[PDB]
Design a protein around this motif. Sequence first.
Motif, PDB file in Angstrom:
ATOM      1  N   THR C  99       5.080   1.894   2.619  1.00  0.00           N
ATOM      2  CA  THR C  99       4.311   1.935   1.387  1.00  0.00           C
ATOM      3  C   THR C  99       2.867   1.512   1.641  1.00  0.00           C
ATOM      4  OG1 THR C  99       4.628  -0.339   0.622  1.00  0.00           O
ATOM      5  CG2 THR C  99       6.450   1.201   0.311  1.00  0.00           C
ATOM      6  N   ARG C 100       2.017   1.766   0.652  1.00  0.00           N
ATOM      7  CA  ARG C 100       0.608   1.388   0.698  1.00  0.00           C
ATOM      8  C   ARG C 100       0.405   0.237  -0.279  1.00  0.00           C
ATOM      9  NH1 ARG C 100      -0.675   2.684   5.566  1.00  0.00           N
ATOM     10  NH2 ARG C 100      -0.033   4.848   5.942  1.00  0.00           N
ATOM     11  N   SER C 101       0.044  -0.938   0.237  1.00  0.00           N
ATOM     12  CA  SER C 101      -0.245  -2.081  -0.621  1.00  0.00           C
ATOM     13  C   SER C 101      -1.635  -2.614  -0.308  1.00  0.00           C
ATOM     14  CB  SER C 101       0.801  -3.186  -0.451  1.00  0.00           C
ATOM     15  OG  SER C 101       0.880  -3.618   0.893  1.00  0.00           O
ATOM     16  N   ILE C 102      -2.350  -3.051  -1.346  1.00  0.00           N
ATOM     17  CA  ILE C 102      -3.720  -3.520  -1.163  1.00  0.00           C
ATOM     18  C   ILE C 102      -3.741  -4.674  -0.175  1.00  0.00           C
ATOM     19  CG2 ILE C 102      -5.681  -4.595  -2.293  1.00  0.00           C
ATOM     20  CD1 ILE C 102      -4.873  -3.085  -4.837  1.00  0.00           C
ATOM     21  N   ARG C 103      -4.573  -4.547   0.852  1.00  0.00           N
ATOM     22  CA  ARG C 103      -4.703  -5.573   1.876  1.00  0.00           C
ATOM     23  C   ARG C 103      -5.723  -6.602   1.412  1.00  0.00           C
ATOM     24  NH1 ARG C 103      -3.366  -6.235   7.260  1.00  0.00           N
ATOM     25  NH2 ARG C 103      -4.827  -7.557   8.426  1.00  0.00           N
ATOM     26  N   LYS C 104      -5.260  -7.820   1.161  1.00  0.00           N
ATOM     27  CA  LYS C 104      -6.089  -8.883   0.615  1.00  0.00           C
ATOM     28  C   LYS C 104      -6.451  -9.880   1.705  1.00  0.00           C
ATOM     29  CE  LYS C 104      -3.936  -8.612  -3.939  1.00  0.00           C
ATOM     30  NZ  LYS C 104      -2.538  -8.468  -3.448  1.00  0.00           N
ATOM     31  N   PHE C 105      -7.656 -10.431   1.599  1.00  0.00           N
ATOM     32  CA  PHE C 105      -8.180 -11.372   2.575  1.00  0.00           C
ATOM     33  C   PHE C 105      -8.517 -12.691   1.896  1.00  0.00           C
ATOM     34  CE2 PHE C 105      -9.309  -7.080   3.812  1.00  0.00           C
ATOM     35  CZ  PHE C 105      -8.797  -6.998   5.084  1.00  0.00           C
ATOM     36  N   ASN C 106      -8.399 -13.778   2.661  1.00  0.00           N
ATOM     37  CA  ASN C 106      -8.679 -15.098   2.112  1.00  0.00           C
ATOM     38  C   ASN C 106     -10.175 -15.324   1.936  1.00  0.00           C
ATOM     39  OD1 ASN C 106      -6.014 -15.820   4.157  1.00  0.00           O
ATOM     40  ND2 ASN C 106      -5.910 -16.359   1.981  1.00  0.00           N
ATOM     41  N   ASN C 126      -5.705   4.927  -2.690  1.00  0.00           N
ATOM     42  CA  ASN C 126      -6.427   5.305  -3.894  1.00  0.00           C
ATOM     43  C   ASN C 126      -5.602   4.930  -5.117  1.00  0.00           C
ATOM     44  OD1 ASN C 126      -8.231   6.460  -5.710  1.00  0.00           O
ATOM     45  ND2 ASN C 126      -8.587   8.242  -4.397  1.00  0.00           N
ATOM     46  N   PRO C 127      -6.098   4.052  -5.991  1.00  0.00           N
ATOM     47  CA  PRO C 127      -5.344   3.695  -7.197  1.00  0.00           C
ATOM     48  C   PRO C 127      -5.478   4.699  -8.328  1.00  0.00           C
ATOM     49  CG  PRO C 127      -7.368   2.452  -7.129  1.00  0.00           C
ATOM     50  CD  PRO C 127      -7.355   3.294  -5.879  1.00  0.00           C
ATOM     51  N   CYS C 128      -6.255   5.766  -8.145  1.00  0.00           N
ATOM     52  CA  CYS C 128      -6.464   6.769  -9.181  1.00  0.00           C
ATOM     53  C   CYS C 128      -5.887   8.129  -8.801  1.00  0.00           C
ATOM     54  CB  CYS C 128      -7.954   6.892  -9.501  1.00  0.00           C
ATOM     55  SG  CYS C 128      -8.824   5.309  -9.600  1.00  0.00           S
ATOM     56  N   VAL C 129      -5.025   8.180  -7.791  1.00  0.00           N
ATOM     57  CA  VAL C 129      -4.405   9.422  -7.364  1.00  0.00           C
ATOM     58  C   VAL C 129      -2.996   9.468  -7.945  1.00  0.00           C
ATOM     59  CG1 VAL C 129      -3.516   8.483  -5.184  1.00  0.00           C
ATOM     60  CG2 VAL C 129      -4.019  10.960  -5.368  1.00  0.00           C
ATOM     61  N   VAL C 130      -2.439  10.679  -8.033  1.00  0.00           N
ATOM     62  CA  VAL C 130      -1.156  10.864  -8.717  1.00  0.00           C
ATOM     63  C   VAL C 130      -0.027  10.048  -8.092  1.00  0.00           C
ATOM     64  CG1 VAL C 130       0.588  12.568  -9.345  1.00  0.00           C
ATOM     65  CG2 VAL C 130      -1.835  13.080  -9.693  1.00  0.00           C
ATOM     66  N   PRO C 131       0.145  10.007  -6.759  1.00  0.00           N
ATOM     67  CA  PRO C 131       1.247   9.197  -6.199  1.00  0.00           C
ATOM     68  C   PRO C 131       1.292   7.759  -6.693  1.00  0.00           C
ATOM     69  CG  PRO C 131       0.353  10.583  -4.494  1.00  0.00           C
ATOM     70  CD  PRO C 131      -0.473  10.855  -5.722  1.00  0.00           C
ATOM     71  N   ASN C 132       0.202   7.010  -6.546  1.00  0.00           N
ATOM     72  CA  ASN C 132       0.142   5.612  -6.969  1.00  0.00           C
ATOM     73  C   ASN C 132      -1.042   5.466  -7.919  1.00  0.00           C
ATOM     74  OD1 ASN C 132       2.234   4.893  -4.905  1.00  0.00           O
ATOM     75  ND2 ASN C 132       0.537   5.316  -3.497  1.00  0.00           N
ATOM     76  N   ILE C 133      -0.767   5.460  -9.220  1.00  0.00           N
ATOM     77  CA  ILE C 133      -1.807   5.404 -10.240  1.00  0.00           C
ATOM     78  C   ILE C 133      -1.511   4.259 -11.199  1.00  0.00           C
ATOM     79  CG2 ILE C 133      -0.683   7.062 -11.801  1.00  0.00           C
ATOM     80  CD1 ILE C 133      -3.577   8.090 -12.420  1.00  0.00           C
ATOM     81  N   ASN C 134      -2.547   3.493 -11.531  1.00  0.00           N
ATOM     82  CA  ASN C 134      -2.481   2.496 -12.588  1.00  0.00           C
ATOM     83  C   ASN C 134      -3.886   2.271 -13.128  1.00  0.00           C
ATOM     84  OD1 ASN C 134      -3.681   0.945 -10.598  1.00  0.00           O
ATOM     85  ND2 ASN C 134      -2.027  -0.555 -10.443  1.00  0.00           N
ATOM     86  N   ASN C 135      -3.962   1.873 -14.399  1.00  0.00           N
ATOM     87  CA  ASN C 135      -5.260   1.806 -15.063  1.00  0.00           C
ATOM     88  C   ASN C 135      -6.061   0.581 -14.642  1.00  0.00           C
ATOM     89  OD1 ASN C 135      -5.486   4.158 -16.912  1.00  0.00           O
ATOM     90  ND2 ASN C 135      -3.590   3.319 -17.769  1.00  0.00           N
ATOM     91  N   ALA C 136      -5.398  -0.552 -14.406  1.00  0.00           N
ATOM     92  CA  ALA C 136      -6.122  -1.782 -14.099  1.00  0.00           C
ATOM     93  C   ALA C 136      -6.905  -1.656 -12.797  1.00  0.00           C
ATOM     94  CB  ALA C 136      -5.148  -2.958 -14.030  1.00  0.00           C
ATOM     95  N   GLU C 137      -6.231  -1.249 -11.720  1.00  0.00           N
ATOM     96  CA  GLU C 137      -6.900  -1.149 -10.427  1.00  0.00           C
ATOM     97  C   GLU C 137      -7.947  -0.044 -10.427  1.00  0.00           C
ATOM     98  OE1 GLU C 137      -3.788  -0.658  -7.609  1.00  0.00           O
ATOM     99  OE2 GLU C 137      -3.181  -2.767  -7.649  1.00  0.00           O
TER     100      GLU C 137
END
Lengths: 201, 104, 145, 48, 117, 48, 35, 65, 111, 162, 126
Positions: C99-106, C126-137
């Motif tokens: 899966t693709r998860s946002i990589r966060k740094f300290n 991409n949080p605005c593409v059809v596979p993984n889409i959500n409004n907040a990100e």
Amino acid sequence: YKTEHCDDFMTGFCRNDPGNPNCLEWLRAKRKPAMSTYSDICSKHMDARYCSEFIRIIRPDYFTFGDTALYVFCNDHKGNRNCWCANYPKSNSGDKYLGPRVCWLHECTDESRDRKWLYYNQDVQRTRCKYVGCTINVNSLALKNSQAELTSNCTRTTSAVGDVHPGEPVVKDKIKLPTWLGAAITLVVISVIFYFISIYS
Amino acid sequence: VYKHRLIVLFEVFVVFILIYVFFRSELNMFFMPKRKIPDPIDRLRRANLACEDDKLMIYGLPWMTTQTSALSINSKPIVYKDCAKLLRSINGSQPVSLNDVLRR
Amino acid sequence: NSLSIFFIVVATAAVCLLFIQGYSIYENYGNIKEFNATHAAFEYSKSIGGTPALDRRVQDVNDTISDVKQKWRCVVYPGNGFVSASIFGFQAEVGPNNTRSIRKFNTMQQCIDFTFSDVININIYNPCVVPNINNAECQFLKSVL
Amino acid sequence: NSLSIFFIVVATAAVCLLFIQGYSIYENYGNIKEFNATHAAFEYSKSI
Amino acid sequence: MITLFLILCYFILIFNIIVPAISEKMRRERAAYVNYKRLNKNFICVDDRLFSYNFTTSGIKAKVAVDNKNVPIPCSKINEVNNNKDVDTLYCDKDRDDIPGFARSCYRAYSDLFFTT
Amino acid sequence: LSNSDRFSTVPVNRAKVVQHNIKHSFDLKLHLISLLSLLVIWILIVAI
Amino acid sequence: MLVVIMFFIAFAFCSWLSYSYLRPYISTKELNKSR
Amino acid sequence: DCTISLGNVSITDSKLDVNNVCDSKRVATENIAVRYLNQEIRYPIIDIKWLPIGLLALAILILAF
Amino acid sequence: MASLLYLILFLLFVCISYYFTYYPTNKLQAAVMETDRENAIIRQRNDEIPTRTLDTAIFTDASTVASAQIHLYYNSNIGKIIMSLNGKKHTFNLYDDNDIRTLLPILLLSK
Amino acid sequence: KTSTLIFFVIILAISALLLWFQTSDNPVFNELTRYMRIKNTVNDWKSLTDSKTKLESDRGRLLAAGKDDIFEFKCVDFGAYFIAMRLDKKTYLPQAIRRGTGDAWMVKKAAKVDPSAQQFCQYLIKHKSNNVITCGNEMLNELGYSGYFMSPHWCSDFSNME
Amino acid sequence: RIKNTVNDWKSLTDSKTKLESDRGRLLAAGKDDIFEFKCVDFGAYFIAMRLDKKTYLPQAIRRGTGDAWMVKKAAKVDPSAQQFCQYLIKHKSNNVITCGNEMLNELGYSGYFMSPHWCSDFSNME
């Protein structure tokens, strides 16, 4: 622009061209829409001349619009050398020279420096700075084929000042030849060639 | 002897062959005019400070079709009752362009 | 025989100049060699284009990209640290099932070190593409560029 | 005359030597000016 | 002996003025082409335009990537030009007055070849 | 104190500095020039 | 005829010298080989 | 605490020396600062592009034959 | 005839030798020469603007004028004029209409 | 007659020798051509660069008096690009992170506010700071130009008072 | 001209030092205290000098490897400066500098032709 009728149109017309004499005259009316429009304009273009006139117009009555514009500009443009009084480049000390501490860095409290780059609280303390030292100022120096020296030994004591370090003798004295040797060899070889040619002929 | 003239002709032929093969483009870019470097001040060369009544104006600017008022340091149009006298004292009756200033 | 005299004097000038040059070169070859060695950069300046020298051997992605939003930046993700973002999306990491998860740094510096390192480590999320889409990100990414 | 030609050749050689020396002075005129700009004080001094 | 003098003049011309000019030109430009090919990039961004070079018997020649409209491709597409093998190109030799600032771009394309020579 | 490193803690022998400057400097060979000029003049007038 | 013969000998020798010294830079076979 | 504020200074073929001695018992010093001029002497080398032309000069002797 | 042909051949010789001696024959020489030419052009254009201090009538307001001594730095490569007036630098863009309208009275009222 | 032919052959032989000298990649030929090229540039630029470098060392000694962080790298914005600059601890001259063997590493900005260029410049400061280039004498001795008399340039005076 | 002048420097120095050695021979007559260190006032500094036993030129107490010691005074009356000069005489008298050729060989100048200097001022005033 003595009345609020042209405020709505000029709000956008002056974002299109902020240096316009008509937009500046609209800002001289010193109403809130004009000052807010130019605070928004100068938060992106604080390094432009019309922002100098804007800061001149607002201060001291409405310095807040210029202060907010300067804050935005100098947090966006961390690398601008003109934001290093308001936003000192040191990581943990950006408020190092805010308020009366503006005097502690004499390049901020300068007459050659535009005061749009200082907050108003920094600008009002620029006239109370107390300076001790020996400053030499030359407005201009046009020197042609003439060496100049400008030294200001500020100590009251007569220092034990010696001689200037001459450097190092990089050049090495290579063994040379007599100066007449090239001419002598050239003339001798030319004459010998001529004599040989004459004998052969 | 004709042989030596033929030798000179052969040498000229070889010169032309070498020039054509290796230095054709350099010689093509020889009669063409040099590249033009833009001058930011070239369009301001004809500008002269005329005066209309008490208002100081700038003439000689081609891209600015309408007469353009001269601005002061704080970007304010210049109005002066002694405009004509100041202009005459600065340079004289004859108009002065920016080209004349640069050529002082 | 004035022409013969002129020919003799000009040929003698040529030969004598050759001999002077030969003697001077023989006696100053080491000198000019050291002069050239210590002034090697003065032969051809590296600003032949009228522009500063540029080492093409060293790569830089800023040279070609003309749109800011195409570039990768470290931006503060509130309550979760710093993330690397661009118009393409966020630098991502592989989950348990590819899966693709946002990589966060300290810290900002770690994010910068990961983002701008020359090692190929680009994983678009991409949080605005059809596979993984959500409004907040998607709204956050639109507001942070 | 052979001796006249020899003298002409030697005169040409000497004049070429003179031209080369003048060219040497010309090439080093910047060095001469630097030396003078640094040491013009000691042009008439009786000590350093 | 005028003709013998002409033979001498043209022999010296060729072999002491022209052929050394060829040698210097070929050495410099072959070295520049080798340094270019060592970059392992088909097109490079010079003066906001994509330039490639080739070596022929007359020396090195620069060409600029253009699209179907003969408008130069900006460097923002450099990658998709390097991968592409059928890029329309215009040689800098033939002067193009339709492209603005073509001469300056071709100048700078030739000029940055000689970062090492 | 801005140019404190410009000065010398040790004394400086400036006479030797000037003497090295004179030693390693272009030598206008007026002796050679004068001898060559006299030879040229004699050859041009007396000899030729 | 001696002038012609000597001129051709010198031209051939000088062309041979130039070709020997300039073949590595004008012969683009190596560049075409490298891809 | 003393300040010198010069104006538009213009000097040509001369020497300038400003010392901020505000009557501080500093003797007037005209010490000439010598340095090591590490001069490179240019050599009388004609541009060897002259070598072909010079050869042509010798060649015109064939006209005198 | 023969003399005309010999003279033509010699002049063709001298012309070709002159071109190959004093003109660029490869891309390195051409680039170097064009750099030098462009630099000379830029330096001349910069030197057109008087570098020395000059007296101008500067309008500090709409109806106020003062005689002031200014310095000007012109950079024609980027097209900008920096005026040092009263110890402060004002940068005028030569592609800006308002900057042009402000700078031109200063330049033209100079003497 | 025969002497004319002998002189003819001798001139062709000397021409062949000069061909050898010119096209054989000779050490002497190369050093002489290099010397002419180098000498002209030295005469043009060495004294200007030395005087300007001494003056800016003076200015940087005056500027660094009191400041403590003036000798660490900061990302300075030059309008169209970023440069990782500092003040050299020895010569008190502007110093910048170098790009290979070329000039300073100028990180291009795509717009007026470019965060990515700022951050890449910070990455250079933390990583690629071992390669540095100084204005003036070092830039002239390594690149052939000093940067003081070229604009726009991060060493030139016009680009810094603008 | 500069080259010729700097060449002549040495001969001018030798002439001046011979003349001044003769004058010192003339001056030293019946005054034994002249051959002992004395602290002399120069208005702005104190120098401890005497006349050389051999060459009969002025000879003062040296400062390191440089010129003679100069105890700067901050006013016309400086008891501390004079007392320090006395301390130099009583302690650091082993190292001395002599005008003329010795100073020429050590420091590059003979002290003469230099204004102000202790050699010329001491010779002229006496």
